[PDB]
């Protein structure tokens, strides 16, 4: 039909009115796919079920034991909770809250509570090479500014003498160069990697080789250990506004009772975050979301076990739609393990669409000629669906995703399913743009 698109290529495809009982396009609509960042709209619709639109992500400083002349005879808590909005001078505040309250000194430890998650930061399934770039910042329970810094690459005057970096002194990280600048010449240059190097309490090394260059290169890594970068800023706010302790930082991982909240920061209502989530296709919304759906379907702290699980509960209990064979590993669509077929987004889908007076869903959506990542996407724009398609992208080396709504000419709304995999921009193009204006003129 107009499948002639790359012959390498993979596509599976489903499009159908709201509420109609059969579709108008089914291709392939079975096939289990790579749903990439269309995951996201599975884990928008269960969080709004599970937590509501109203929820909030917080974080507190706790008390544990009595006050007396300023003293804290006890310990300090920090009890983070996966606020991936949480910031630098949110600590700063709460700190300053804590300070006012007539907290001077802390006669005991300072804990570092993460007890809100458990096991490992990442989902199964995430590619290891990508976990020091921000985009796959492992979403742990501890969150500063996106747990994402920057750094400076010089390379040296000399060649053969080790590239230096510098780093803003605000960043709790540990770098080391073994980074050699090479000649403009170097036969070096062609396989030589410039590479980083994670290593325990947030320490990285650079290494390999890199090009003398006029001007420093710039590069942002992902924190690797949350709880430990989010005590040293702890550590440095209370030290600036005076307050002493005697213990250590130490992590509490293990759930316990909460003690008094001294200080607190709630983010933004979760409506919002799900519409940053959507229409920036934000990894980090998704997955704190997608381990404080299991924390609190369950009651246990949040894992990706319990994640998954509760997802799936939530899509078959409260929205009808049992996924059958479907993977769900995260909520971000990262992991190469998530596998659904259009046929099950489907039904998502048309939960949405029903139930979307409810949810007020759609509009969270990037909207085709408007914002998101439909602002202008060729396919789109040429078909003349601008401000007719709302849709999730999920887009990765090869794969170009869509999953969404779309208005037609006689004003009806049609759900649909784009699974695209495999494609090595001309014939993407081609395709969409005969394909939605298809769907739009004629339905
Ligand atoms: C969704 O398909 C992917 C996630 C990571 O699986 C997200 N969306 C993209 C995009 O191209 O829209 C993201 C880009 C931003 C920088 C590199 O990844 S990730």
Redesign the pocket.
Known sequence: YITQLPAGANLALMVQKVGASAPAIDYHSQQMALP??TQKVITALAALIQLGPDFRFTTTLETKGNVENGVLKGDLVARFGADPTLKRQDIRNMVATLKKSGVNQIDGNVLIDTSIFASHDKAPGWPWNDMTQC??APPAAAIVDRNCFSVSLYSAPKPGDMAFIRVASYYPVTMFSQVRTLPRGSAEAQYCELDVVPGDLNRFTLTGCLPQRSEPLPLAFAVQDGASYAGAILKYELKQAGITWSGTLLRQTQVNEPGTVVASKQSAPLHDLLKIMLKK?D?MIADTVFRMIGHARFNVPGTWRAGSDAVRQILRQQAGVDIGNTIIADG???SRHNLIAPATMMQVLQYIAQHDNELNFISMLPLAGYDG?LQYRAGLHQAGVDGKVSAK????QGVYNLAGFITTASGQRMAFVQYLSGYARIPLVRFESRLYKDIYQNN
């Open positions: 990439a960042s985009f796959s296709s990894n971000s669509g990262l990542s992208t999920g887009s990765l």
